[PDB]
């Protein structure tokens, strides 16, 4: 019988078990229960000399154990590590025994299960059917996982179930409390195994008066007096609160494959269960699959920025999107409004204008393929849209096109014909509506809560979490319900263990580590944006993993660190370690001194056998590069999800390995290796940005900086500063010194072609990341053209992104910083920040002569505004009172205070765009008096 695995889980009673929940071909679901053992690793000696004899033990082979402790050497006499060799035994037992000198401890009893047994938590297995004995209906027990899970088949499709919920509560103060406030609304999106999606909402009837309830029943709703009274097909129901809560219980008490919410783990579910306890004294109960354990719902936490989780043990996965997008996405606000805003969007086109309402259409080529369809999907329960920015309007008419959408909005008439359409701000005042409760707002808020619940599913389909949860269970060998609950240090041990088991290696740290805190990293800061004449945007393809491969860094390829407390010891040691330890078999790095006291720290690495971290990284990059292709060759729509989730997985795992070498408590911990990263890397950065000036002309000049040398040694690799390109024609375009970062490189062409300059970056990629480079270091060429405004770190600027497809281009103009979201300040006299920003942007449409015009106009107009309304809505840019007599925080008629500061600011912040350092401090002085 051929099953596909859904999720594995554990049980922590007196007795341990592992459960597999699985679905067959036809859809009938099965539970399989294995015992759960504590594992250990012993040397042969300890294996036989041990008593009592263990439960089971089978030999692993013949492994090499290595000590990797880091010891600062002083003279030069570097010694060699204890690389013992022996025969290993893997020992399993049902209880917890403490055994002295048992290595290979850092791993969980769950990885030992999947590895030593040949089981992958994503497999589609044809079970061998004689080993599975009945326990109960859909609960078979197994004893020999090897023979039972011996087969394998190609992957086959299954159905799944869901439930997406939301509640809304009565409130009148700051923000409600379970002891004082009843639950007004309760919504639910129920998608069944048979695959029909049913929506419904329940309305608290103790909140309304008698004849209003009458109008409701006459109006289309339903009324119920008990649990048995409800059907799941009524679009709306009216019921008391006890019934509402009993339905919530009974319906989260089922075996849904997922239960998806948004902040549902500390607010929604906590409210529901607590109110239920409060009113009726009954509880939410979870059985085991074998009916021999019962638990009650009680949220717990995993403080790491905490994260709340649900304590269920029947196989369900209780997801919560809030945590997931907090982890996997780096956004500025994690309010449902903003994510639903920028995720779901499309460009629409007006067909007829009108009075106080307009009509839009959304389709094919009007904008990119597909998002019209998604927009039409969420529009099915939408109420308020945003007109291209900031302009909220209620929806008037909906129409599901065959391919897009027609919508009619209550928005005022506008000039243009094409617009952005961004789905959600929902400016609604809830408290007031709670003050004057009548039937109409009840029927409105039903439409709001149901839409919220459905958004909580449109997102889960937008991110494809259902396939990341599987890619992460195959790579990151672990159950499906662990994949998003833990930190990097806990998820890498799977692939690491699988590596150690092929290379017959064990690493043991017999020392207690010491922490020498250090730099995290240097911040790079550009000094001009705009007139620069559109910068390219060359990118690094995974520097840190490439460096950890080149230098062959590892905790066990480190010969030693040698130091020196004073000069005349450096130069001794220094001509010494070149006579011995010569390149290329050896690479040596100067690090930042550990104990603030000496001044050396040369670390030496042996580039003759593969370190462990280099093996790991090599496989990761290798397989990501493959799935990058099988995606390009996939045609069905179910594969293009599986492969894309896989490459994303490998990307994550790779980019998580540098920062983890530094973590003192990880398993890849190696102080010297961490410090040698950032060191090789930052030499690499300076070596690129240095040779980049390269005024190309006379059919190819491109000297770069000066020389094309290779640091760390002489490679004998054609250092010829002059070089001939493909050379489309002759040119006279020179490059300006650049700014760069850990990840990118902003080479600002000073010639400024017009948009064809691109042909210049192509061929530039042709050479720099191909001829001015040594090993696996390589090419990217992204593109962020136009005259950005770098108001700060790479995080804050204009977007203005116009990718390599310049043919008939439309760029992303709006914003990259989005530090324009939190106020925490006053709100009267600004709002110009927008207008100042837009003026400064539009003034640089040209590139040559609007520099002086920029400074002149911005500072003159700012002075005129400031003076006019010093003597006669928005403050976002992410109580002590002052007088204004120079020529709990609220405003008064005392506006003349902060006119003075923010106007100084608006120009003091944006300084990395212009170079007219004259009028800048000139207006600075003008406003001084």
Joined together, the tokens standing for residue 790 give 């770098």
8 A C-beta contact, residue 63 and residue 505? yes
Q: Which residues pair with 35 in a beta bridge?
A: 17
SS3 353: coil
What is the rounded CA–CA span in Å between residue 73 and residue 903?
A: 58
Joined together, the tokens standing for residue 103 give 């290595």
What is the rounded CA–CA span in Å between residue 58 and residue 144?
A: 14
DSSP state of 14: S
Which residue, 124, 151, 154, is CA-closest to 3? Answer: 124
Half-sphere exposure of 810 (CA within 13 A, CB side): 6
Q: In what order do the strands lie in the sheet with 237-239?
A: 162-169, 183-191, 197-204, 237-239
What is the rounded CA–CA span in Å between residue 612 and residue 66?
A: 12
8 A C-beta contact, residue 260 and residue 168? no
Q: Which residues contact 428 (CB under 8 A, 6 or more apart)?
A: 448
Joined together, the tokens standing for residue 906 give 């608006």
Peptide bond into 812 cis (omega under 30): no
8 A C-beta contact, residue 387 and residue 408? no
SS3 92: strand
| Phi, psi for residue 29 in degrees, rounded to 5 | -105, 145
Peptide bond into 584 cis (omega under 30): yes
8 A C-beta contact, residue 525 and residue 912? yes
What is the rounded CA–CA span in Å between residue 36 and residue 94?
A: 7
What is the rounded CA–CA span in Å between residue 84 and residue 67?
A: 9
Which residue, 526, 801, 546, 847, is CA-closest to 689? Answer: 526
* R_g of the chain computed on alpha carbons: 33
Q: In what order do the strands lie in the sheet with 586-590?
A: 72-73, 558-562, 602-606, 586-590
- Neighbour-count burial of 531, counting CB atoms closer than 10 A to its CB (0-12 exposed, 13-18 middle, 19+ buried): buried
What is the residue whose two structure tokens read 């000094």?
527
8 A C-beta contact, residue 648 and residue 463? no
Letter string b/e over residues 814-838, b meaning 16 or more CB atoms within 10 A of that residue's CB: eebbbebeeeeeeeebbebbeebbe
What is the rounded CA–CA span in Å between residue 148 and residue 702?
A: 65
8 A C-beta contact, residue 610 and residue 550? no
Helices 639-655 & 543-550 angle (0-180, nearest 10)? 60
800: region left, alpha or beta (phi > 0 left; psi from -120 to 50 alpha): left
| Phi, psi for residue 349 in degrees, rounded to 5 | -135, 130
8 A C-beta contact, residue 585 and residue 703? no
8 A C-beta contact, residue 910 and residue 791? yes
What is the rounded CA–CA span in Å between residue 282 and residue 619?
A: 53
Joined together, the tokens standing for residue 465 give 């979490």
3-state DSSP: the chain helix, strand, coil percent, rounded to 5?
30, 20, 50
Joined together, the tokens standing for residue 688 give 């690129």
SS3 871: helix
Breaks (C–N over 2.5 Å) after residues, the chain:
304, 872, 878, 887
What is the rounded CA–CA span in Å between residue 841 and residue 836?
A: 9
Show the CA angle centred on residue 187, arms to residues 184 and 193, nearest 5°: 155
What is the rounded CA–CA span in Å between residue 748 and residue 788?
A: 11
Q: Which residues contact 507 (CB under 8 A, 6 or more apart)?
A: 66, 68, 500, 555, 556, 612
Q: Which residues contact 288 (CB under 8 A, 6 or more apart)?
A: 11, 19, 294, 313, 314
| Rounded alpha-carbon distances, angstroms, from residue 652 to 128, 487, 488, 655, 656 | 36, 12, 10, 5, 6
Joined together, the tokens standing for residue 504 give 């017959």
8 A C-beta contact, residue 827 and residue 777? no
What is the rounded CA–CA span in Å between residue 81 and residue 559?
A: 9
Cα 706 from chain centroid?
40
Which residue, 246, 253, 238, is CA-closest to 279? Answer: 246
8 A C-beta contact, residue 707 and residue 719? yes
8 A C-beta contact, residue 424 and residue 384? yes
Which residue, 94, 258, 275, 114, is CA-closest to 184? Answer: 275
The continuous run of DSSP H or E covering 649 comes out as: helix 639-655
Q: Which residues contact 261 (CB under 8 A, 6 or more apart)?
A: 164, 165, 166, 268, 269, 319, 320, 321, 456
SS3 386: strand
SS3 457: helix
Joined together, the tokens standing for residue 901 give 């500061």
101: region left, alpha or beta (phi > 0 left; psi from -120 to 50 alpha): left
Q: DSSP alpha helices (H): ranges in 677-797?
A: 679-690, 758-771
How many CB atoms are located within 10 Å of the residue 622 CB?
10
The continuous run of DSSP H or E covering 493 comes out as: helix 493-502
Joined together, the tokens standing for residue 861 give 């107009």
Q: Which residues contact 149 (CB under 8 A, 6 or more apart)?
A: 117, 118, 119, 123, 125, 127
How many CB atoms are located within 10 Å of the residue 105 CB?
8
What is the rounded CA–CA span in Å between residue 27 and residue 14?
A: 33
The continuous run of DSSP H or E covering 140 comes out as: strand 139-141
DSSP state of 82: -
Q: Which residues pair with 39 in a beta bridge?
A: 92
DSSP state of 206: G
What is the rounded CA–CA span in Å between residue 554 and residue 661?
A: 9
Half-sphere exposure of 154 (CA within 13 A, CB side): 0
Joined together, the tokens standing for residue 4 give 């596909």
Which residue, 223, 245, 256, 220, is CA-closest to 235? Answer: 220
The continuous run of DSSP H or E covering 395 comes out as: strand 392-400
- Neighbour-count burial of 680, counting CB atoms closer than 10 A to its CB (0-12 exposed, 13-18 middle, 19+ buried): buried
What is the rounded CA–CA span in Å between residue 887 and residue 884?
A: 8
Q: Which residues contact 439 (CB under 8 A, 6 or more apart)?
A: 208, 212, 215, 216, 219
Concatenated DSSP letters of 495-545: HHHHHHHHTTEEEE--S----------PPP--S--STTT-B--EE-S-HHH
Helices (H) and strands (E) in the chain, counts: 26, 34
């Amino acid at each position: 019988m051929d099953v596909r695995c859904i999720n594995w889980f554990e049980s922590h009673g007196e007795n341990r078990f592992l459960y597999l929940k699985s679905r067959c071909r036809n859809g009938e679901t099965v539970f399989i229960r294995f015992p759960h053992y504590f594992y250990y690793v012993v040397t042969d000696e300890i294996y036989q000399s041990l008593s009592p004899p263990p439960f089971n033990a089978r030999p692993m082979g013949k492994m090499r154990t290595i000590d990797i402790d880091e010891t600062i050497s002083y003279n030069l006499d570097i010694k060699d590590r204890k690389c013992s060799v022996a025969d290993m035994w893997l020992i399993e037992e049902p209880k917890k025994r403490s055994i002295q000198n048992a290595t290979m401890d850092e791993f969980f009893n769950i990885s030992w299960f999947y590895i030593s047994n040949g089981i992958s938590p994503d497999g589609c297995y044809s079970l061998d059917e004689q080993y599975l004995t009945k326990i109960n209906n859909g609960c078979y027990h197994c004893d020999d996982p090897r023979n039972c899970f011996a087969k394998e088949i190609p992957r086959f499709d299954i159905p799944r179930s869901y439930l997406f919920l939301d509640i809304e509560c009565h409130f009148d103060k700051k923000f409600p409390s379970v002891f004082i406030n009843p639950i007004s609304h309760t919504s639910y999106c129920y998608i069944d195994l048979s695959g029909k999606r049913l929506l419904f909402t329940l309305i608290n009837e103790e909140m309304l008066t008698e004849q209003e309830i009458q109008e409701a029943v006459d109006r289309g709703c339903l009324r119920i007096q008990s649990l048995m009274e409800m059907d799941y097909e009524r679009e709306l129901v009216l019921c008391s609160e006890i019934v509402l809560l009993r339905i919530a219980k009974q319906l989260l008490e089922l075996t849904f494959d997922y239960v998806v919410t948004f902040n549902g783990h500390n607010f929604d579910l906590r409210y529901i269960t607590n109110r239920l306890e409060l009113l009726t004294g009954e509880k939410i109960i979870f059985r085991s699959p074998d009916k021999k354990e019962a638990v009650h719902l009680c949220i717990y936490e995993r403080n790491q920025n905490t994260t709340f989780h649900v304590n269920n043990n029947n196989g369900t996965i209780f997801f919560d999107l809030y945590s997931f997008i907090q982890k996997s996405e780096k956004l500025d606000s994690y309010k449902l409004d903003s994510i639903s805003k920028n995720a779901f969007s499309c460009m629409g086109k007006v067909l007829n204008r009108g009075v106080r309402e307009m009509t839009f259409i959304g389709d094919d080529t009007t904008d990119a393929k597909g998002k019209a369809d998604t927009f039409a999907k969420v529009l099915t329960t939408g109420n308020y849209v945003t007109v291209d920015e900031d302009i909220i309007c209620k929806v008037i008419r909906k129409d599901i096109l065959e391919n897009g959408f027609k919508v009619v909005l209550s928005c005022p008439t506008l000039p243009n014909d094409i617009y952005k359409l961004s789905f959600g701000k929902d400016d609604i005042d809830l408290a007031q509506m709670y003050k004057d409760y009548n039937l109409n707002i009840a029927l409105d808020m039903a439409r709001y809560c149901i839409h919220d619940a459905c958004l909580c599913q449109y997102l889960w389909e937008y991110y494809g979490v259902e396939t990341k949860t599987d890619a992460g269970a195959a790579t990151y060998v672990l159950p499906q319900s662990m994949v998003f609950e833990y930190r990097a240090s806990t998820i890498i041990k799977g692939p690491l263990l699988k590596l150690l088991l092929e290379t017959k290696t064990i690493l043991v740290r017999s020392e207690t580590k010491q922490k020498f805190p250090y730099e995290g990293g240097k911040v790079f800061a550009p000094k001009q944006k705009m007139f620069s004449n559109n910068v390219l945007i060359f990118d690094y393809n995974s520097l840190y993993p490439n460096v950890c491969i080149f230098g062959n860094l590892s905790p066990e390829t480190l010969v030693g660190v040698v130091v020196s407390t004073n000069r005349l010891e450096e130069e001794i040691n220094n001509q010494l370690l070149l006579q011995k330890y010569p390149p290329p078999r050896y690479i040596t790095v100067h690090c930042e001194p550990r104990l603030p006291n000496l001044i050396s720290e040369i670390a030496i690495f042996d580039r003759s056998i593969e370190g462990t971290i280099p093996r790991l990284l090599r496989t990761f990059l290798a397989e990501r590069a493959r799935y990058k292709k099988m995606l390009k060759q996939a045609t069905s729509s179910t594969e293009k999800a599986i492969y894309d989730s896989m490459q994303y997985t490998y990307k994550i795992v790779a980019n998580s390995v540098y920062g983890l070498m530094g973590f003192r408590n990880s398993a890849l911990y190696s102080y010297a290796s961490a410090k040698s990263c950032t060191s090789i890397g930052r030499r690499m950065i300076l070596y690129l940005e240095s040779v980049l000036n390269g005024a190309e002309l006379s059919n190819g000049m491109l000297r770069f900086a000066n020389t094309l040398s290779n640091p760390f040694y002489m490679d004998d690799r054609d250092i010829n500063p002059i070089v001939k390109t493909s050379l489309p024609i002759d040119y006279r375009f020179r490059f300006r010194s650049v700014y760069g970062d850990t990840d990118s490189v902003f080479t600002e062409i000073d010639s400024q072609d017009v948009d064809k300059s691109i042909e210049i970056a192509k061929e530039l990629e042709r050479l720099i990341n191909s001829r001015v480079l040594f090993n696996n270091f390589k090419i990217e060429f992204e593109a962020v053209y136009k005259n950005l405004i770098m108001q700060s770190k790479k995080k804050y600027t204009t977007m203005k992104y116009s990718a390599s497809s310049n043919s008939k281009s439309v760029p992303e103009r709006i914003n990259k910083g989005t530090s324009e979201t939190r106020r925490d300040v006053s709100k009267f006299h600004k709002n110009m920040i927008k207008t100042y920003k837009t003026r400064l942007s539009e003034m640089l449409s040209e590139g040559r002569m609007n520099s002086n015009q920029v400074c002149i106009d911005i500072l003159r107009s700012l002075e005129t505004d400031l003076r006019s309304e010093f003597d006669s809505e928005l403050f976002m840019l992410s109580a002590y009172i002052c007088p204004a007599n120079v020529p709990s925080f609220k405003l008064g008629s005392n506006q003349r205070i902060f006119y003075e500061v923010y106007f100084k600011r608006l120009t003091s912040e944006i300084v990395n765009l212009l170079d007219n350092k004259v009028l800048c401090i000139s207006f600075f002085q003008r406003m001084f008096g």
